Design a protein around this ligand. Structure first.
Ligand code: HEM
Ligand code: HEM
Ligand code: HEM
Lengths: 723, 307, 721, 83, 84
């Protein structure tokens, strides 16, 4: 009786006996990608193949289908310890999420220094190009809780753990070069204001609400980073296509004791690319896991995220030579003033096996420095140093979270600390220094032997709570940012402010934010005002504007599209096809796309296979319904008489093309497929619409169009199109 | 100048002179909607108007803008207990989300019986129509974490807490009359299958993934509620517009000691209605808080949920 | 300059150019087992290693906070300081809600011969297997800083790390418990714990709320009798018995069920302190039992116990004058004998008390195939409790990944996450699955998959105490009637001292009234001690009858029913400078011939000089090691030594006290002068006097075999000491 | 230390620990939150007119006395302690 | 396992039945392993034959004659569909 057998112990095989690919644990899909940290983690992995299902005490379970009851139809007995152990564990699976950056995704990889930096720092992981330093990286949004969507408008967090031989180094950054506030003491205020509001917990993953803008309008130090997140920087196409920043000034100390001021950068090898807002929002609807899935699959496809580590290097004596404080984390250092020296490369090449064990439980902290690096007097950074260890006391269950496998260093770590919850190490020597009973081991290490020492910076002043006057400059860099943008980029900025303010209920908040904008730029202020129905007063357009910064009015590096590259490799293309499609054209489109590292995905009216007009079967990647255009970078439709006519009776298929058009994407049409474009209320083909009959030649010109990322010149006409 | 003032202690008013309506706490918008439970809660409420900002120890704070430093450009001092108290509390704001039904929304109200049910049960809250029994209800989805969107295809939870004179009675049901599994020992298995998959934590808020349907395919007892959630019952239009069910048979015992088998239902006064799948998917994009917002605004507008 | 260096980093050796207690890996590395080998991966060796932060960063200056100048303000950027203090601030985890005070050790278990006839349990199948164990001994009432030698039940928890699962035998040192139904456990414990207003008293049941509860709950009297007896004050964890208390089931390969009760019988005998001595010992060595066990393992006097079983065929369950499912009943060994089936040896101390003893987690629900539960309603409630408590005590549901708690067999399942998850899983987290061909898989019962014995269940859902449980006095009476007269007196002593500290007189009268239903002599003696007049109706309360024709059971008496072992006992040798050196040698060599440890206590530490001029290493001062810490006292000759001791009030009092505690005292030669000068009656059977040292010590050892001079007890009450 | 001993950052709401004066601020949430807040949870705010508000020192708002600070960042025992 | 699913299916209006069909097809179309989709469709042939066919159509699954002849459950205490 086969229906009965389902509710009885399962002692027999379940897979189909034959025993494209589903995402998998990194051990299964890329076991050849290795490093020392991953090897350390191997001792905690399991291979259940052939193993009995057991209790946590190692007792074999005979019947995982039924509680122990007084009969087959009786009451459940308290003596069912198997039941209670299983349900107990389940009941306590969840731990608190991070207080900020709750939504995040991680990957393993390695870092290599290009050549010794010994002139600037004694930091071990920067001294030897032959070494492969293991890293773990967690990318994240900021505001949303752990289940919130990926492609929201938000700052992205970027945390890199370097497992070095002289200690674990945490570089804990964001994807914009500045932060919203100058002093750590404002952080809970700013976070509370951006977070969902406390009465109703609305809205999720969105700064487009009253309390956030209220805080903004009253704290103009925030305006610079607000400019960044209102720009397309706030909606990145990929964690692989975004820049990274330590933000704060740090010190590096070399072996002679000389001190250089530094700032950390990540520069993506795959370029800097963003979504556009309408597309990002729709993408939260149909793939809330987009960024996370994309990072996971790029590593399985060998499109490994690569990034170069950069340093702006300021000798100690040039500290006060700028038109801002380099200790101010709302200020960036213009790359035209101080160039970013590329000093190394990091590659993420292996996904986790278990997201919770690795990504959920990893703990970064800016406090986690190494000899050769030191802190500056950045008042935001200083308060950060306390929070990361503190928060982890409850997030990860006590002071022994460094013993969780992903958090373990790969060098030794002997000390006199003991106990705490879930103590894993067993210590049998003296727990106090100095001791003689164990000859004072472990022993302090002199500085020349690599013991950590603080650089003896001078300290002069009075104990006080007061903002440094070198910090009162809230507008010069918001202007520098704005003047550095192309016009398309400035329009998206204006669009960000306008859409967000349009969800602000209290009018006076909207009025006061627009007022702030009149101190950054008058066109920006005026354009946002119009979208909001605010008449600016004559005096407001007379508001004084900040001057230049060390001779700079703009900086090309501040603009995404004028200042950084677009890379074709890794992009996604939807191939729209139904039964009766030209098999040859699909072959030649797919091959041309992959010749450039572009992934073609066939979307059809059903999954499984479609049969070509030649009568051959083509595997389908998914339905058009299930994979709308916001999920791909471009769209191509091959020929086939019966395929094109099927698609013309498909509102999804037609909307695909209208939507891709409105989102400024490349569209390729082969042969009769152009009759499908003609039937839509889309204008004459522009430079991002490619038509031909030879499928290989068409695919080639298409790929060449996709190099522009988006068809910006199309932005104006797409505003009228109804989709 | 007044740019300097924003980074100095703020002693002056900030609201504009003048002094269509935003969502607000229930105490500000419906202070006349009362019950005993709400009255019990009044003593834990605050009235900050006119009050000084203080530490948790009651100490007045003069400067909420700056850490204590060695000079205005100096290093932050460990002796700033104000900073460290403020940051400590923030660092530990979070608590674990519910392991299932993490995403949810709640409201206060009251329950009355129509006429004594003494023929079937001695339960106090089912004896006297004159009693205004306070309730608190939490609606929820099932699979998604606390930040996941409202209009997903999922079962909806429906938990009602009756604060009765003889005890708190919880009716912890769903919006469909059956469940997926028969024996509680399978719940972790079923939950694990439907949840985001363990290697990558994908997908959020959706049963549209291999492990869920692997379980279904191998456990046909699940087919009935699967039928329910693939219907439009799985994408309700509002929590005010869905049915509720205790699902389990209970027992009511009257004063003679006669037992009846009983099943609990909620029938919405505003009817039973659902989105259509494409509109429900689009709503997760443009208002992930739709059901939460709708319930809150409906109460603020006097379109009180009634069941 | 050298004072300056003590507050500067310490980069140089501090070690200088009988032995102390040390971690087990230092002292007995050759004693090993499979579980200790598993623990090695978690052990550390900081020799030659730099002091480092938890992230692996070497520390240069462990003496100073980072400040704004040598005299300045401490800076928030000092992460070394803040990480160090932070770990320190969170060292403590909750203590166990009961049995907070305890001590642990590793060892192994061996079955003598396969028990396949009665059970399929793997660790009882193969006499050649050495099954590792970890054992925690404990008191019950006190918190973790409370004293070892209080009057209390002793807990006895053994974790057997078997190849088919971890099995926990969580028992006590008496064969019954105080209550019948688990629901009463928090009531009983609240009553015995310190009272909730003032948190007084620590480690004592001698207060109002305990005796109040006893007086209203006669089911408690049986175990009260045990703890009021000298069983409540064991000499040593090595010298008590052990019991699982509950009736368990044992299932063999045919599916035949035997009812089972577990026992540990100590190889070193069963011996106890006396009350006055025990109480003094909580004063001068609150770690007596922990230290003694630690040191007995380091000495080689390894704790050894034989596992016993009383075996009852299923069809005999209803053939007794008591319910075998009642945890306040014991099964008299005269009716159902204890078959010794295996042996436990404790042979290795832990390395880190907190990592191993504090964090170990036991639960009676941790059974293995071949064993099953009974319907004992105490035991059924216990099954829920142990796992639940450990959720907060050890911080979540992954406590089984703490190394002391890990099985040594595989443990694959579909559980995931939870706080401080160590394991990294990569396969399907649900059963049934096909994506991993459903591994790990359920195991058929014939393959070792656990199954529950299909006991019949017939009844009505109800809250009711089984009528067969309502017998409260017959076993207390049997236990009373089985004691020697000295043991009965100490029982009377126990009740009278404890009730003496009860403030509300009606509680004392109500307890005495309960006693009149057990034995009238017992009640009368306690009543007299408390100034209580017993009515004639009370003197005439009806007494229970024999249990299955039984009115005594010799095994219920420590001293008449069990053996006293001379080996491993401790003897104080009182000596100062000028002691006869050959006497000491001769005493030592004799003590050693019988396995007894001689400890030289002198007026100062270091070495003393003998009258022959040789130096003798001292074990401690007289003042630091009073007579309550040793089993017997011997005083060697030597004119200058004796004269020194007679000028020493402590040394004189050492002899008076040991006398009053009924201990053997040996006196050589002029040493008798010291005894004679004291306000002591003339020598008795336990005052060995002699001139030849070797002879005297041999005779002195022979007197020790008796443990105590019970006949001395009457005159002992008149001794001013 | 009290975060783990007393179960989180709201141990000030345990009765014995409560102050007897007012104590409004913008802290929220945390394990076992007893008090129920209903106003803006950030400062500065305008939606509740910035209440609760900072208090001037002459009104009793805490201030650190401006002691001079002069030295070098360093881990060193003060010579004046060496006795 | 199947009588009550069938009773639910037959109580649905035609629109509601189409939306149920859309649910399975949309969801099962994100399932990567093909044998899982085919087993799910195989369970649906014990509930209703049309339901199985409409969903197997959207998944590119050809039903077999053996499957299209799978026995369907009988009525529930005389009841074949319930308006509620
Ligand atoms: C310079 C501006 C800052 C940047 C770029 C930054 C960056 C980050 C990032 C990337 C994370 C998430 C790391 C991860 O788990 O993957 C994070 C977490 C966090 N940050 Fe910040 N942060 C900044 C400022 C602050 C400030 C001022 C505070 C408050 C003192 C703060 C407190 C926290 C806390 C508590 C967490 C959660 C840590 C955890 O749960 O493990 N951060 N920050
Ligand atoms: C009859 C089917 C079930 C229904 C209708 C149901 C309903 C619910 C609901 C509505 C909630 C959310 C309550 C809230 O708002 O806080 C919930 C939570 C929960 N349920 Fe279920 N449930 C069912 C079955 C199960 C089973 C079998 C288990 C496992 C034994 C389980 C364990 C849980 C747990 C652990 C929570 C979280 C509770 C909390 O954190 O407060 N439920 N259930
Ligand atoms: C026959 C009666 C009982 C005996 C012999 C017994 C024995 C013990 C022993 C020896 C321990 C200490 C284990 C260790 O060293 O870690 C202990 C702990 C404990 N027992 Fe009992 N017990 C009994 C009854 C009960 C009952 C009725 C309950 C409550 C239902 C209970 C609850 C506990 C709890 C909560 C602990 C602490 C467990 C832990 O924290 O690890 N026990 N028991």
């Amino acid at each position: 009786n086969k229906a009965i057998s389902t509710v009885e112990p399962h002692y027999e095989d379940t897979a189909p006996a034959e025993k494209v690919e589903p995402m998998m644990p990194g051990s299964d899909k890329t076991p050849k990608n290795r490093n020392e940290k991953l090897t350390q983690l191997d001792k905690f992995r399991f291979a259940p193949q052939g193993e009995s299902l057991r209790t946590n005490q190692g007792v074999k379970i005979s019947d995982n289908q039924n509680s122990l009851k007084s009969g087959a139809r009786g009451s459940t007995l308290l003596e069912d310890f198997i039941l209670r152990e299983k349900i107990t564990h389940f009941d306590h699976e969840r731990i608190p999420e991070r207080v900020v950056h709750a939504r995040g995704t991680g990957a393993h990889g390695y870092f290599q220094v290009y050549e010794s930096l010994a002139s600037y720092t004694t930091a071990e992981f920067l001294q030897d190009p032959s070494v492969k330093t293991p890293v773990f990286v967690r990318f994240s949004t900021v505001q949303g809780s752990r289940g919130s969507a990926d492609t929201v408008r938000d700052i992205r967090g970027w945390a890199t753990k370097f497992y070095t031989k002289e200690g674990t180094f945490d570089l804990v950054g964001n994807n914009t070069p500045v932060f919203f506030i100058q002093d750590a003491i404002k952080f809970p205020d700013f976070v509370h204001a951006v977070k969902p509001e406390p009465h109703n917990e609305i809205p999720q993953g969105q700064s487009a609400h009253d309390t956030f803008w209220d805080y903004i309008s009253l704290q103009p130090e925030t305006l610079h980073n607000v400019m960044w997140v209102m720009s397309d920087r706030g909606i990145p196409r990929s964690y692989r296509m975004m820049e990274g920043f330590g933000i704060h000034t740090y010190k590096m100390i070399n072996a002679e004791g000389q001190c250089h001021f530094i700032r950390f950068h990540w520069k993506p090898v795959y370029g800097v690319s963003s979504l556009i807002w309408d597309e990002a929002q729709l993408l939260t609807g149909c793939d809330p896991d987009f960024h996370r899935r994309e990072l996971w699959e790029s590593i399985e496809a060998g499109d490994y995220p690569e990034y170069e580590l950069g340093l702006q290097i300021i000798p100690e004596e040039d500290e006060h030579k700028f038109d801002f404080d380099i200790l101010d984390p709302t200020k960036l250092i213009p790359e035209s003033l101080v160039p970013v020296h590329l000093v190394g490369k990091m590659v993420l090449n292996r996904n986790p096996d278990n997201y919770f064990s690795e990504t959920e439980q990893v703990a970064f902290c800016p406090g986690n420095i190494v000899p050769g690096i030191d802190f500056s007097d950045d008042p935001l950074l200083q308060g950060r140093l306390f929070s990361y260890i503190d928060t982890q006391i409850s997030r990860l269950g006590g002071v022994n979270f460094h013993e969780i496998p992903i958090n373990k260093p790969i060098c030794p770590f002997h000390n006199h600390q003991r106990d705490g919850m879930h103590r894993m190490s067993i210590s049998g020597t003296a727990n106090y220094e100095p001791n003689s009973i164990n000859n004072n081991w472990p022993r302090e290490a002199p500085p020349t032997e690599g013991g950590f020492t603080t650089y003896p910076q001078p300290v002069n002043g009075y104990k006080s709570r007061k903002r440094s006057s070198t910090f009162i400059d809230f507008y010069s860099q918001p202007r520098l940012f704005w003047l550095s943008q192309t016009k398309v980029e400035q329009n998206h900025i204006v669009g960000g402010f306008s859409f967000e303010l349009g969800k602000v209920v209290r009018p006076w908040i909207r009025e006061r934010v627009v007022n702030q904008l009149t101190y950054i730029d008058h066109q920006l202020a005026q354009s946002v005002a119009d979208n909001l129905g605010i008449k600016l007063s004559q005096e407001q357009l007379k508001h004084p504007l900040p001057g230049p910064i060390n001779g700079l009015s703009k900086d090309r590096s501040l603009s995404m599209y004028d200042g950084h590259h677009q890379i074709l490799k890794s992009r996604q293309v939807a191939i729209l096809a139904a039964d009766g499609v030209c098999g040859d054209a699909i072959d030649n489109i797919m091959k041309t796309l992959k010749k450039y590292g572009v992934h073609g995905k066939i979307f059809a009216p059903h999954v499984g296979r479609i049969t070509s007009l030649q009568g051959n079967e083509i595997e389908v990647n998914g339905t058009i319904e299930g994979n709308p255009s916001v999920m791909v970078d471009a769209v191509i439709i091959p020929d086939g008489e019966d395929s094109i006519d099927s698609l013309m009776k498909n509102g999804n298929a037609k909307h695909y093309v209208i939507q891709a058009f409105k989102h400024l994407k490349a569209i390729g049409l082969q042969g009769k497929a152009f009759k499908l474009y003609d039937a839509l209320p889309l204008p004459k083909p522009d430079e991002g619409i490619v038509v031909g009959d030879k499928a290989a030649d068409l695919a080639e010109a298409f790929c060449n169009v996709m190099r522009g990322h988006r068809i910006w010149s199309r932005e104006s006409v797409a505003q009228e199109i109804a989709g």
